[PDB]
Write a protein that binds this ligand. Sequence first.
Ligand code: NA
Ligand code: NA
Lengths: 72, 72
Amino acid sequence: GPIITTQVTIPKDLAGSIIGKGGQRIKQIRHESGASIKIDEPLEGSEDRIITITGTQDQIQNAQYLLQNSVK
Amino acid sequence: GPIITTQVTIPKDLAGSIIGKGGQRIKQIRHESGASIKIDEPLEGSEDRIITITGTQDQIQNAQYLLQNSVK
DNA sequence: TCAGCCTC
DNA sequence: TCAGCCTC
Ligand code: NA
Ligand code: NA
């Protein structure tokens, strides 16, 4: 119902696995759920990288799982 | 029992599919069966490319199938 | 995931 | 097969 936000963290060397070829993999996840999903560049000394999900309660929920399924 | 030969033909753009990364895929097939498997370069006007299996009756037989399974 | 794997 | 996919 209400439009909120979350931030997860995955290692910088799982970036390629879940982004996709010309970033086609991520585009799939975005349009499927309707979650505003954004992957960040790693800081000065950063093994992890932030993912910034942004939709309603439900829109965010699915994305949580879908972004552990191109790690397959 | 007796050591013989066969030649199959696949399109030149199925070469990559069955050869493998640094030709690791083909090396697998060779040692598995014991067949002397060799993939050829395409002639002046050649859509196909020859594969030159060379072992005993049995050694050759398996290779026949295994070289239609990296086309998967 | 799903594209491209070119070797003795 | 089985590696690497870097995008709104
Ligand atoms: Na799901
Ligand atoms: Na077999």
